[PDB]
Design a protein around this ligand. Sequence first.
Ligand SMILES: Nc1ncnc2c1ncn2[C@@H]1O[C@H](COP(=O)(O)OP(=O)(O)O)[C@@H](O)[C@H]1O
Ligand SMILES: Nc1ncnc2c1ncn2[C@@H]1O[C@H](COP(=O)(O)OP(=O)(O)O)[C@@H](O)[C@H]1O
Ligand SMILES: Nc1ncnc2c1ncn2[C@@H]1O[C@H](COP(=O)(O)OP(=O)(O)O)[C@@H](O)[C@H]1O
Ligand code: BEF
Ligand code: BEF
Lengths: 24, 492, 209
Amino acid sequence: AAAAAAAAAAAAAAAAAAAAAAAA
Amino acid sequence: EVGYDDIGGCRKQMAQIREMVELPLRHPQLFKAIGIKPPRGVLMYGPPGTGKTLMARAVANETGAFFFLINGPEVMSKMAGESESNLRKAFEEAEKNAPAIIFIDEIDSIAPKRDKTNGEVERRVVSQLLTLMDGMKARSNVVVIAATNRPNSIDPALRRFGRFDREVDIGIPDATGRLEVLRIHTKNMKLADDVDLEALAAETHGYVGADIASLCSEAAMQQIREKMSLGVTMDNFRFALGNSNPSALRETVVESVNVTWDDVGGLDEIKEELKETVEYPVLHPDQYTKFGLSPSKGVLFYGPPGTGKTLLAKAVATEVSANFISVKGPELLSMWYGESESNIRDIFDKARAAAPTVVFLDELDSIAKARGGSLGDAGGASDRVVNQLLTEMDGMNAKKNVFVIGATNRPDQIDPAILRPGRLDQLIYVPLPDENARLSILNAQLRKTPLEPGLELTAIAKATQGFSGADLLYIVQRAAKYAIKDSIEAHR
Amino acid sequence: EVGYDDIGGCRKQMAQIREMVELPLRHPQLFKAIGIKPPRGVLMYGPPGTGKTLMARAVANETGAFFFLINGPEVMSKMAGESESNLRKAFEEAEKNAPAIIFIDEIDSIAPKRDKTNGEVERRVVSQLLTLMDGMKARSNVVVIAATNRPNSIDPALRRFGRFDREVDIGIPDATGRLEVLRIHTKNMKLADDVDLEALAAETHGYVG
Ligand SMILES: Nc1ncnc2c1ncn2[C@@H]1O[C@H](COP(=O)(O)OP(=O)(O)O)[C@@H](O)[C@H]1O
Ligand SMILES: Nc1ncnc2c1ncn2[C@@H]1O[C@H](COP(=O)(O)OP(=O)(O)O)[C@@H](O)[C@H]1O
Ligand SMILES: Nc1ncnc2c1ncn2[C@@H]1O[C@H](COP(=O)(O)OP(=O)(O)O)[C@@H](O)[C@H]1O
Ligand code: BEF
Ligand code: BEF
């Protein structure tokens, strides 16, 4: 009888990328 | 020096905090032939801004000891030795120079949970204090009096065996504790002989400690703008209640409704019943300890829409001395994965540390979400906001004002887990106002308005039988719109 | 110079920011013998286009002091912790030339929330500004002004007792407030005998400034 009308994506935290500060 | 009068009248957390640091350091004889030694390192939680650094200065003056102060986040630098060798100097220099008391604060960002970082410079630094605190085996000589708020950010690796297994909580200075912090701030400034300190501490009730020095200093600026041997008059503190603004309530800046217990409510029996159960545990705690009954935390509103279930929520916002944090229904529910379970936790945690406080959770149909027959309505088990609120509810509620105001139109969609008698004990329903109560609805709107002389009034309430309380707002607006329409036609 | 005549409208707010900067500088003995001086910081939040950068130009030219300007994220560099020192160098130059006026801009990235942020440079500039603010206790000082939006993106450790405790909102003028704005911006221009400034702000109702 009842059919689900949605999957409702609620997740996913993506990538990141760092910032390498040079040392000397 | 700050002495002992820097925190006065708060001996419910000031005399018992001397049992942890001063009394072990006074003599080592009480720990002999008693077995284990509990107070190795204590952990202090509570509202931030009460004197967490003043009490670190108070222990150094009353007890003669070598005090080495650490400001906290100043050590953060990318130099191997500037953030590694200096923390070793804080443990070894105090050992030879006995006693070895040490203080650190603002450890919110320092040592986070292990999911945030892994093998970085910041994770390498905070692992050295795990073995340096365990390395000091001096008998009743070293103690950690570390003062840090926001307890959900501290990783639980520091409370394993004996490092921070002594939990102490700084209470709110409510029972004659807020009077002495105003006493020490007026002995150095100028004041006129027209104010009363008991009346100043009894009007406002929402204090965070750091705002206590802010409300008195705001009255000093009020005397400057009128006057352009000075003193602070009576009306300078009277200007301070319109902008209280504590440090914890810095996100609720919504407009407050003007209510004087006469512009709301057609019923007085059900209105007085919710007033009586919300004013007892906030004023004095001696009545609940004598009767022995547990105080009810939170009330549910249900019935027809437009009856006055959120209009009364604005009435509990200003007249009740407890603080008011409002939410706009399902707005406290984020998009991301863990951000949705955190936003319903950050609001309840930031309020309970300074809590003469009621909260207004609106639209419980969007919170309970009819969990019976879920079938994955939120996707990948994202409907876990119903039981996360059950963890915040009935958690550390021994003399803690947490009154959830639930205004709801359909009572059948709420799951009965919150309806259990261990969580909510008062169930009130606002019924249809009769002919004796509809006259109070129209008198609330015809109070502060210019009006005509008296026409028939009881015949209006006798003909509108069958409609709710918001429907009489429609008949009072059409009568008020027709008073402005003919006024422009009377002009020219 | 812009002065105070260039800031039109918001007269309920202009008295708040003038008594915290000029009155400690004009009469420093007035704050004596009445306790500690209250105003140490202010956060100018709200909508972006309300006239919030010219308020820093107004306090940099009306009173006679030194104006050192700090932009948004500009202190970031590739060194062994220069961002915690170059921000510290901006406050030690203000301590040398006291009294002066400093201005920090775009507090949306320099001081974010600690739990939401990620990184090692962005989480240490939020820690460095916490220590040098309350530790600095000099009288007749450069006490900080900031002009940014999103007040909910500000950490609550920045608003506790003495860092930012007199925060104000630049309100949106809805009635008789945009009339003062148009009297200033068209004062430099030579208008003809055809416009009516009583009717310009009356027919429009939504603007930002
Ligand atoms: N009665 C009081 N109790 C606590 N702090 C008080 C009181 N009266 C004034 N204060 C002030 O409130 C502030 C409390 O900050 P504190 O908790 O020591 O710092 P932090 O929480 O950042 O470590 C101090 O500036 C202190 O002087
Ligand atoms: N006597 C009254 N008391 C409170 N609100 C009233 C009254 N008469 C009319 N109203 C108005 O009717 C509306 C209904 O208020 P309320 O029942 O609290 O909210 P809701 O309709 O969202 O459940 C509000 O706008 C309120 O101001
Ligand atoms: N008092 C004021 N009312 C309205 N607009 C103003 C006011 N002062 C300056 N402006 C306008 O603001 C702009 C310059 O500052 P602005 O761009 O708003 O700075 P920011 O975006 O950094 O807040 C110009 O367009 C100027 O005309
Ligand atoms: F606004 Be009510 F809670 F329907
Ligand atoms: F230039 Be403003 F501070 F956005």
